[PDB]
PDB file of C-alpha atoms in Angstrom:
ATOM      1  CA  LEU A   8      13.608-202.089   4.439  1.00  0.00           C
ATOM      2  CA  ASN A   9      12.070-205.221   2.883  1.00  0.00           C
ATOM      3  CA  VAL A  10       9.247-204.834   0.344  1.00  0.00           C
ATOM      4  CA  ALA A  11       5.893-204.308   2.147  1.00  0.00           C
ATOM      5  CA  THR A  12       3.684-207.439   2.074  1.00  0.00           C
ATOM      6  CA  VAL A  13       1.017-207.699   5.053  1.00  0.00           C
ATOM      7  CA  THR A  14      -0.462-205.596   7.739  1.00  0.00           C
ATOM      8  CA  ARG A  15      -2.391-207.075  10.611  1.00  0.00           C
ATOM      9  CA  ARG A  16      -5.486-208.950   9.595  1.00  0.00           C
ATOM     10  CA  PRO A  17      -8.524-206.737   8.785  1.00  0.00           C
ATOM     11  CA  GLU A  18     -10.840-206.017  11.719  1.00  0.00           C
ATOM     12  CA  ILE A  19     -14.534-205.964  10.839  1.00  0.00           C
ATOM     13  CA  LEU A  20     -17.427-205.028  13.147  1.00  0.00           C
ATOM     14  CA  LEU A  21     -20.895-206.317  12.221  1.00  0.00           C
ATOM     15  CA  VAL A  22     -23.823-204.519  13.881  1.00  0.00           C
ATOM     16  CA  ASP A  23     -27.314-206.059  13.799  1.00  0.00           C
ATOM     17  CA  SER A  24     -29.868-207.206  16.336  1.00  0.00           C
ATOM     18  CA  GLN A  25     -31.222-209.824  13.915  1.00  0.00           C
ATOM     19  CA  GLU A  26     -29.688-213.244  14.521  1.00  0.00           C
ATOM     20  CA  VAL A  27     -30.374-214.487  10.959  1.00  0.00           C
ATOM     21  CA  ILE A  28     -28.213-211.636   9.617  1.00  0.00           C
ATOM     22  CA  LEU A  29     -25.382-212.155  12.118  1.00  0.00           C
ATOM     23  CA  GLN A  30     -25.463-215.846  11.299  1.00  0.00           C
ATOM     24  CA  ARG A  31     -25.396-215.393   7.535  1.00  0.00           C
ATOM     25  CA  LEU A  32     -22.499-212.924   7.929  1.00  0.00           C
ATOM     26  CA  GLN A  33     -20.555-215.285  10.217  1.00  0.00           C
ATOM     27  CA  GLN A  34     -21.106-218.196   7.797  1.00  0.00           C
ATOM     28  CA  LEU A  35     -19.893-216.104   4.826  1.00  0.00           C
ATOM     29  CA  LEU A  36     -17.019-214.275   6.474  1.00  0.00           C
ATOM     30  CA  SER A  37     -15.546-216.659   9.053  1.00  0.00           C
ATOM     31  CA  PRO A  38     -13.659-218.737   6.418  1.00  0.00           C
ATOM     32  CA  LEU A  39     -11.894-215.572   5.198  1.00  0.00           C
ATOM     33  CA  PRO A  40      -8.809-213.963   6.829  1.00  0.00           C
ATOM     34  CA  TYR A  41     -10.604-211.340   8.875  1.00  0.00           C
ATOM     35  CA  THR A  42     -10.987-210.711  12.619  1.00  0.00           C
ATOM     36  CA  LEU A  43     -14.726-210.387  13.245  1.00  0.00           C
ATOM     37  CA  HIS A  44     -16.644-208.661  16.054  1.00  0.00           C
ATOM     38  CA  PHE A  45     -20.427-208.769  16.472  1.00  0.00           C
ATOM     39  CA  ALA A  46     -22.536-206.084  18.118  1.00  0.00           C
ATOM     40  CA  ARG A  47     -26.241-206.418  18.795  1.00  0.00           C
ATOM     41  CA  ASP A  48     -26.988-202.724  19.423  1.00  0.00           C
ATOM     42  CA  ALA A  49     -25.464-199.293  18.837  1.00  0.00           C
ATOM     43  CA  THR A  50     -24.071-198.961  22.366  1.00  0.00           C
ATOM     44  CA  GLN A  51     -22.181-202.242  22.044  1.00  0.00           C
ATOM     45  CA  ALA A  52     -20.818-201.127  18.668  1.00  0.00           C
ATOM     46  CA  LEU A  53     -19.553-197.872  20.140  1.00  0.00           C
ATOM     47  CA  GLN A  54     -17.961-199.601  23.125  1.00  0.00           C
ATOM     48  CA  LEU A  55     -16.211-202.092  20.818  1.00  0.00           C
ATOM     49  CA  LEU A  56     -14.859-199.221  18.726  1.00  0.00           C
ATOM     50  CA  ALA A  57     -13.516-197.446  21.800  1.00  0.00           C
ATOM     51  CA  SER A  58     -11.657-200.611  22.796  1.00  0.00           C
ATOM     52  CA  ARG A  59      -9.736-201.571  19.632  1.00  0.00           C
ATOM     53  CA  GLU A  60      -8.865-200.592  16.066  1.00  0.00           C
ATOM     54  CA  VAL A  61     -11.612-201.458  13.589  1.00  0.00           C
ATOM     55  CA  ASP A  62     -11.131-201.148   9.837  1.00  0.00           C
ATOM     56  CA  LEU A  63     -14.714-201.584   8.680  1.00  0.00           C
ATOM     57  CA  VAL A  64     -18.149-201.352  10.304  1.00  0.00           C
ATOM     58  CA  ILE A  65     -21.182-202.897   8.598  1.00  0.00           C
ATOM     59  CA  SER A  66     -24.409-201.774  10.305  1.00  0.00           C
ATOM     60  CA  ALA A  67     -28.073-202.559   9.910  1.00  0.00           C
ATOM     61  CA  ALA A  68     -30.442-199.616   9.501  1.00  0.00           C
ATOM     62  CA  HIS A  69     -32.653-200.550  12.471  1.00  0.00           C
ATOM     63  CA  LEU A  70     -31.102-200.916  15.979  1.00  0.00           C
ATOM     64  CA  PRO A  71     -32.261-200.419  19.669  1.00  0.00           C
ATOM     65  CA  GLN A  72     -30.767-196.993  20.907  1.00  0.00           C
ATOM     66  CA  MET A  73     -30.255-195.131  17.652  1.00  0.00           C
ATOM     67  CA  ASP A  74     -30.700-196.232  14.096  1.00  0.00           C
ATOM     68  CA  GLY A  75     -27.865-197.351  11.867  1.00  0.00           C
ATOM     69  CA  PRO A  76     -27.452-194.092   9.917  1.00  0.00           C
ATOM     70  CA  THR A  77     -27.219-192.211  13.251  1.00  0.00           C
ATOM     71  CA  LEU A  78     -24.639-194.680  14.569  1.00  0.00           C
ATOM     72  CA  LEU A  79     -22.641-194.412  11.339  1.00  0.00           C
ATOM     73  CA  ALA A  80     -22.722-190.606  11.539  1.00  0.00           C
ATOM     74  CA  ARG A  81     -21.222-190.774  15.023  1.00  0.00           C
ATOM     75  CA  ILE A  82     -18.605-193.291  13.892  1.00  0.00           C
ATOM     76  CA  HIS A  83     -17.640-191.045  10.956  1.00  0.00           C
ATOM     77  CA  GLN A  84     -16.759-188.200  13.286  1.00  0.00           C
ATOM     78  CA  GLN A  85     -15.361-190.148  16.261  1.00  0.00           C
ATOM     79  CA  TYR A  86     -13.613-193.000  14.442  1.00  0.00           C
ATOM     80  CA  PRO A  87     -12.620-191.570  11.071  1.00  0.00           C
ATOM     81  CA  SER A  88     -10.201-194.510  10.381  1.00  0.00           C
ATOM     82  CA  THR A  89     -13.107-196.940  10.158  1.00  0.00           C
ATOM     83  CA  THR A  90     -14.816-197.344   6.737  1.00  0.00           C
ATOM     84  CA  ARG A  91     -18.631-197.472   6.920  1.00  0.00           C
ATOM     85  CA  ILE A  92     -21.231-199.664   5.192  1.00  0.00           C
ATOM     86  CA  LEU A  93     -25.029-199.724   5.576  1.00  0.00           C
ATOM     87  CA  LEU A  94     -26.677-203.121   5.172  1.00  0.00           C
ATOM     88  CA  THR A  95     -30.491-202.969   5.005  1.00  0.00           C
ATOM     89  CA  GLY A  96     -33.585-204.305   3.232  1.00  0.00           C
ATOM     90  CA  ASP A  97     -35.579-201.209   4.215  1.00  0.00           C
ATOM     91  CA  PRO A  98     -36.300-199.259   1.008  1.00  0.00           C
ATOM     92  CA  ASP A  99     -37.005-195.993   2.932  1.00  0.00           C
ATOM     93  CA  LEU A 100     -34.945-193.372   1.132  1.00  0.00           C
ATOM     94  CA  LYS A 101     -35.187-191.023   4.111  1.00  0.00           C
ATOM     95  CA  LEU A 102     -33.104-193.523   6.103  1.00  0.00           C
ATOM     96  CA  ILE A 103     -30.768-194.077   3.101  1.00  0.00           C
ATOM     97  CA  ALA A 104     -30.387-190.306   2.742  1.00  0.00           C
ATOM     98  CA  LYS A 105     -29.277-190.006   6.316  1.00  0.00           C
ATOM     99  CA  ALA A 106     -26.751-192.765   5.786  1.00  0.00           C
ATOM    100  CA  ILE A 107     -25.322-190.801   2.831  1.00  0.00           C
ATOM    101  CA  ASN A 108     -25.564-187.282   4.200  1.00  0.00           C
ATOM    102  CA  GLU A 109     -24.701-187.843   7.831  1.00  0.00           C
ATOM    103  CA  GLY A 110     -23.297-191.403   7.865  1.00  0.00           C
ATOM    104  CA  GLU A 111     -21.176-190.763   4.723  1.00  0.00           C
ATOM    105  CA  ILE A 112     -21.279-194.461   3.962  1.00  0.00           C
ATOM    106  CA  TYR A 113     -18.804-195.918   1.521  1.00  0.00           C
ATOM    107  CA  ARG A 114     -21.127-198.668   0.272  1.00  0.00           C
ATOM    108  CA  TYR A 115     -24.776-199.632   0.575  1.00  0.00           C
ATOM    109  CA  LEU A 116     -25.848-203.297   0.555  1.00  0.00           C
ATOM    110  CA  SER A 117     -29.366-204.797   0.607  1.00  0.00           C
ATOM    111  CA  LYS A 118     -30.868-207.576   2.717  1.00  0.00           C
ATOM    112  CA  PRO A 119     -30.861-210.146   1.231  1.00  0.00           C
ATOM    113  CA  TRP A 120     -27.533-209.681  -0.546  1.00  0.00           C
ATOM    114  CA  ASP A 121     -25.629-211.488  -3.249  1.00  0.00           C
ATOM    115  CA  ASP A 122     -22.580-213.088  -1.583  1.00  0.00           C
ATOM    116  CA  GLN A 123     -20.062-212.119  -4.283  1.00  0.00           C
ATOM    117  CA  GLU A 124     -21.384-208.518  -4.415  1.00  0.00           C
ATOM    118  CA  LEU A 125     -20.972-208.225  -0.642  1.00  0.00           C
ATOM    119  CA  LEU A 126     -17.462-209.744  -0.744  1.00  0.00           C
ATOM    120  CA  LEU A 127     -16.416-207.330  -3.488  1.00  0.00           C
ATOM    121  CA  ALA A 128     -17.790-204.343  -1.486  1.00  0.00           C
ATOM    122  CA  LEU A 129     -15.788-205.597   1.488  1.00  0.00           C
ATOM    123  CA  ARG A 130     -12.547-205.809  -0.569  1.00  0.00           C
ATOM    124  CA  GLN A 131     -13.138-202.311  -1.931  1.00  0.00           C
ATOM    125  CA  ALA A 132     -13.924-200.948   1.520  1.00  0.00           C
ATOM    126  CA  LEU A 133     -10.809-202.485   3.101  1.00  0.00           C
ATOM    127  CA  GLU A 134      -8.610-201.235   0.306  1.00  0.00           C
ATOM    128  CA  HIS A 135     -10.136-197.744   0.708  1.00  0.00           C
ATOM    129  CA  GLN A 136      -9.528-197.855   4.443  1.00  0.00           C
ATOM    130  CA  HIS A 137      -5.902-198.828   3.939  1.00  0.00           C
ATOM    131  CA  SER A 138      -5.303-196.095   1.343  1.00  0.00           C
ATOM    132  CA  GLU A 139      -6.956-193.491   3.603  1.00  0.00           C
ATOM    133  CA  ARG A 140      -4.875-194.614   6.590  1.00  0.00           C
ATOM    134  CA  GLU A 141      -1.738-194.239   4.479  1.00  0.00           C
ATOM    135  CA  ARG A 142      -2.732-190.580   4.239  1.00  0.00           C
ATOM    136  CA  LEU A 143      -3.348-189.386   7.798  1.00  0.00           C
TER     137      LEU A 143
ATOM    138  CA  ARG B  25      -9.239-169.727  -5.162  1.00  0.00           C
ATOM    139  CA  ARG B  26     -12.954-169.401  -5.978  1.00  0.00           C
ATOM    140  CA  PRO B  27     -14.904-172.720  -5.986  1.00  0.00           C
ATOM    141  CA  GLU B  28     -16.106-174.037  -9.310  1.00  0.00           C
ATOM    142  CA  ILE B  29     -19.512-175.771  -9.453  1.00  0.00           C
ATOM    143  CA  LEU B  30     -21.019-177.722 -12.366  1.00  0.00           C
ATOM    144  CA  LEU B  31     -24.799-178.063 -12.347  1.00  0.00           C
ATOM    145  CA  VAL B  32     -26.301-180.795 -14.529  1.00  0.00           C
ATOM    146  CA  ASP B  33     -30.093-181.020 -15.055  1.00  0.00           C
ATOM    147  CA  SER B  34     -32.251-181.787 -18.073  1.00  0.00           C
ATOM    148  CA  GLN B  35     -34.577-178.844 -17.384  1.00  0.00           C
ATOM    149  CA  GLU B  36     -33.880-175.216 -18.106  1.00  0.00           C
ATOM    150  CA  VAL B  37     -36.205-174.177 -15.238  1.00  0.00           C
ATOM    151  CA  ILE B  38     -34.084-176.059 -12.702  1.00  0.00           C
ATOM    152  CA  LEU B  39     -30.802-174.613 -13.961  1.00  0.00           C
ATOM    153  CA  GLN B  40     -32.388-171.139 -13.791  1.00  0.00           C
ATOM    154  CA  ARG B  41     -33.417-171.711 -10.226  1.00  0.00           C
ATOM    155  CA  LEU B  42     -30.023-172.991  -9.206  1.00  0.00           C
ATOM    156  CA  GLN B  43     -28.421-169.970 -10.900  1.00  0.00           C
ATOM    157  CA  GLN B  44     -30.638-167.658  -8.929  1.00  0.00           C
ATOM    158  CA  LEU B  45     -29.929-169.387  -5.655  1.00  0.00           C
ATOM    159  CA  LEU B  46     -26.174-169.528  -6.184  1.00  0.00           C
ATOM    160  CA  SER B  47     -25.251-166.335  -8.088  1.00  0.00           C
ATOM    161  CA  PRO B  48     -25.184-164.284  -4.832  1.00  0.00           C
ATOM    162  CA  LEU B  49     -22.386-166.541  -3.506  1.00  0.00           C
ATOM    163  CA  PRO B  50     -18.699-166.389  -4.494  1.00  0.00           C
ATOM    164  CA  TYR B  51     -18.811-169.477  -6.699  1.00  0.00           C
ATOM    165  CA  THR B  52     -18.023-169.868 -10.379  1.00  0.00           C
ATOM    166  CA  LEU B  53     -20.956-171.722 -12.013  1.00  0.00           C
ATOM    167  CA  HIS B  54     -21.100-173.963 -15.079  1.00  0.00           C
ATOM    168  CA  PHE B  55     -24.326-175.415 -16.521  1.00  0.00           C
ATOM    169  CA  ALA B  56     -25.071-178.575 -18.460  1.00  0.00           C
ATOM    170  CA  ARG B  57     -28.331-180.096 -19.753  1.00  0.00           C
ATOM    171  CA  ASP B  58     -26.979-183.608 -20.291  1.00  0.00           C
ATOM    172  CA  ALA B  59     -23.929-185.807 -19.747  1.00  0.00           C
ATOM    173  CA  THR B  60     -22.264-184.821 -23.046  1.00  0.00           C
ATOM    174  CA  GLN B  61     -22.352-181.146 -22.089  1.00  0.00           C
ATOM    175  CA  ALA B  62     -21.145-181.953 -18.558  1.00  0.00           C
ATOM    176  CA  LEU B  63     -18.168-183.886 -19.899  1.00  0.00           C
ATOM    177  CA  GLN B  64     -17.306-181.060 -22.319  1.00  0.00           C
ATOM    178  CA  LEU B  65     -17.214-178.625 -19.407  1.00  0.00           C
ATOM    179  CA  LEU B  66     -15.222-181.012 -17.226  1.00  0.00           C
ATOM    180  CA  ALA B  67     -12.544-181.214 -19.921  1.00  0.00           C
ATOM    181  CA  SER B  68     -12.370-177.444 -20.353  1.00  0.00           C
ATOM    182  CA  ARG B  69     -12.881-175.928 -16.869  1.00  0.00           C
ATOM    183  CA  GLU B  70     -11.632-176.523 -13.382  1.00  0.00           C
ATOM    184  CA  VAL B  71     -14.547-178.101 -11.544  1.00  0.00           C
ATOM    185  CA  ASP B  72     -14.622-178.763  -7.811  1.00  0.00           C
ATOM    186  CA  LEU B  73     -18.247-179.778  -7.211  1.00  0.00           C
ATOM    187  CA  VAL B  74     -20.704-181.509  -9.539  1.00  0.00           C
ATOM    188  CA  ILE B  75     -24.453-181.512  -8.787  1.00  0.00           C
ATOM    189  CA  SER B  76     -26.469-183.774 -11.115  1.00  0.00           C
ATOM    190  CA  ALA B  77     -30.041-184.803 -11.626  1.00  0.00           C
ATOM    191  CA  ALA B  78     -30.768-188.527 -11.901  1.00  0.00           C
ATOM    192  CA  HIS B  79     -32.659-188.446 -15.177  1.00  0.00           C
ATOM    193  CA  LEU B  80     -30.770-187.127 -18.175  1.00  0.00           C
ATOM    194  CA  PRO B  81     -31.547-187.659 -21.881  1.00  0.00           C
ATOM    195  CA  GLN B  82     -28.844-190.221 -22.591  1.00  0.00           C
ATOM    196  CA  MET B  83     -26.233-191.307 -20.011  1.00  0.00           C
ATOM    197  CA  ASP B  84     -28.089-190.936 -16.702  1.00  0.00           C
ATOM    198  CA  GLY B  85     -27.076-189.130 -13.544  1.00  0.00           C
ATOM    199  CA  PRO B  86     -25.664-192.024 -11.473  1.00  0.00           C
ATOM    200  CA  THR B  87     -23.764-193.316 -14.545  1.00  0.00           C
ATOM    201  CA  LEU B  88     -22.391-189.807 -15.171  1.00  0.00           C
ATOM    202  CA  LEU B  89     -21.402-189.441 -11.507  1.00  0.00           C
ATOM    203  CA  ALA B  90     -19.629-192.820 -11.612  1.00  0.00           C
ATOM    204  CA  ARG B  91     -17.763-191.686 -14.750  1.00  0.00           C
ATOM    205  CA  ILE B  92     -16.774-188.441 -12.965  1.00  0.00           C
ATOM    206  CA  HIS B  93     -15.571-190.386  -9.907  1.00  0.00           C
ATOM    207  CA  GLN B  94     -13.340-192.431 -12.222  1.00  0.00           C
ATOM    208  CA  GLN B  95     -12.087-189.632 -14.479  1.00  0.00           C
ATOM    209  CA  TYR B  96     -12.084-186.621 -12.132  1.00  0.00           C
ATOM    210  CA  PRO B  97     -11.607-188.245  -8.701  1.00  0.00           C
ATOM    211  CA  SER B  98     -10.774-184.984  -6.886  1.00  0.00           C
ATOM    212  CA  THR B  99     -14.318-183.721  -7.445  1.00  0.00           C
ATOM    213  CA  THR B 100     -17.082-183.942  -4.859  1.00  0.00           C
ATOM    214  CA  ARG B 101     -20.470-185.067  -6.273  1.00  0.00           C
ATOM    215  CA  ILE B 102     -24.092-184.548  -5.222  1.00  0.00           C
ATOM    216  CA  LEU B 103     -27.192-186.276  -6.608  1.00  0.00           C
ATOM    217  CA  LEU B 104     -30.163-183.882  -6.707  1.00  0.00           C
ATOM    218  CA  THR B 105     -33.273-185.728  -7.957  1.00  0.00           C
ATOM    219  CA  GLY B 106     -37.067-185.818  -7.681  1.00  0.00           C
ATOM    220  CA  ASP B 107     -37.114-189.566  -8.290  1.00  0.00           C
ATOM    221  CA  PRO B 108     -36.786-191.580  -5.036  1.00  0.00           C
ATOM    222  CA  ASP B 109     -35.579-194.687  -6.836  1.00  0.00           C
ATOM    223  CA  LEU B 110     -33.482-196.942  -4.645  1.00  0.00           C
ATOM    224  CA  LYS B 111     -31.746-198.437  -7.713  1.00  0.00           C
ATOM    225  CA  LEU B 112     -30.524-194.985  -8.830  1.00  0.00           C
ATOM    226  CA  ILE B 113     -29.469-193.957  -5.325  1.00  0.00           C
ATOM    227  CA  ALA B 114     -27.638-197.245  -4.745  1.00  0.00           C
ATOM    228  CA  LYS B 115     -25.616-196.826  -7.921  1.00  0.00           C
ATOM    229  CA  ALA B 116     -24.898-193.216  -7.030  1.00  0.00           C
ATOM    230  CA  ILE B 117     -23.417-194.457  -3.698  1.00  0.00           C
ATOM    231  CA  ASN B 118     -21.587-197.579  -4.826  1.00  0.00           C
ATOM    232  CA  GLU B 119     -20.288-196.372  -8.189  1.00  0.00           C
ATOM    233  CA  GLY B 120     -20.698-192.582  -7.969  1.00  0.00           C
ATOM    234  CA  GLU B 121     -19.465-192.268  -4.348  1.00  0.00           C
ATOM    235  CA  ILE B 122     -21.751-189.269  -3.929  1.00  0.00           C
ATOM    236  CA  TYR B 123     -21.168-186.958  -1.001  1.00  0.00           C
ATOM    237  CA  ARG B 124     -24.808-185.942  -0.633  1.00  0.00           C
ATOM    238  CA  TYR B 125     -28.242-186.979  -1.948  1.00  0.00           C
ATOM    239  CA  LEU B 126     -31.025-184.370  -1.897  1.00  0.00           C
ATOM    240  CA  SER B 127     -34.580-184.570  -3.184  1.00  0.00           C
ATOM    241  CA  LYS B 128     -36.133-182.062  -5.578  1.00  0.00           C
ATOM    242  CA  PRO B 129     -37.781-179.774  -4.822  1.00  0.00           C
ATOM    243  CA  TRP B 130     -34.947-178.900  -2.487  1.00  0.00           C
ATOM    244  CA  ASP B 131     -34.796-176.923   0.731  1.00  0.00           C
ATOM    245  CA  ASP B 132     -32.565-173.882   0.021  1.00  0.00           C
ATOM    246  CA  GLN B 133     -30.995-173.946   3.507  1.00  0.00           C
ATOM    247  CA  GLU B 134     -30.156-177.640   3.239  1.00  0.00           C
ATOM    248  CA  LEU B 135     -28.788-177.370  -0.276  1.00  0.00           C
ATOM    249  CA  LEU B 136     -26.583-174.413   0.676  1.00  0.00           C
ATOM    250  CA  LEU B 137     -25.327-176.322   3.726  1.00  0.00           C
ATOM    251  CA  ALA B 138     -24.483-179.320   1.549  1.00  0.00           C
ATOM    252  CA  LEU B 139     -22.398-177.055  -0.676  1.00  0.00           C
ATOM    253  CA  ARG B 140     -20.555-175.461   2.238  1.00  0.00           C
ATOM    254  CA  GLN B 141     -19.829-178.894   3.692  1.00  0.00           C
ATOM    255  CA  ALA B 142     -18.816-180.281   0.273  1.00  0.00           C
ATOM    256  CA  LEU B 143     -16.410-177.370  -0.260  1.00  0.00           C
ATOM    257  CA  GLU B 144     -14.816-177.899   3.154  1.00  0.00           C
ATOM    258  CA  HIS B 145     -14.568-181.639   2.298  1.00  0.00           C
ATOM    259  CA  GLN B 146     -13.297-180.908  -1.268  1.00  0.00           C
ATOM    260  CA  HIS B 147     -10.724-178.548   0.270  1.00  0.00           C
ATOM    261  CA  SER B 148      -8.903-181.145   2.395  1.00  0.00           C
ATOM    262  CA  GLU B 149      -9.288-184.193   0.089  1.00  0.00           C
TER     263      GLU B 149
END
């Protein structure tokens, strides 16, 4: 076989009800070689995940049906191939603790974020996802 | 084999309390009061799980946990701290890749659960 080069393009799901956040994410990420999906509540996120492979989910902390840490906890158990990131400006460490202890997030990012910090977390998360998928 | 747990906290009283909580269980315990002692133990003992405070006299807890992630990647790491500082917690996630974060004073039932889950996670990783 030929040397391995590229898999299919990364698939990223962004979950937030706030339009400013979805817009800032689209502006930052759409020029890069990723397939993006946007979900405006937890139920939409879960339905998207049931319908296609997703490499990375980035969720807000606050969402309509269940909060972000709760959503990420469900995703951890039901979609273990998807790497998980919490994106929030809420400093509540009870919510953060849930994201760690139940969501098992790979990275935590603040709102607002530094663009290059977020892009680096994304690279690290996609590389982690690929290495983990090489395993199981 | 028997799980090996390293406990890192600046205070004798806290190490004593962890020893009392954990000595009934079939775990081999190691104790450190700072990052230098933790690193000495890590180089001289098999360690599966590391539990660290956030505040330590020199190199702090999240920095120590990041160093352990880099140098001893097969370990599972827990931050156990009384300081709800977002900056410390964020570093413990993004650089330490902690498995659990618990506040001090802890709930015994929750801390013991975290260890059982960590050992089951440590087992398969």
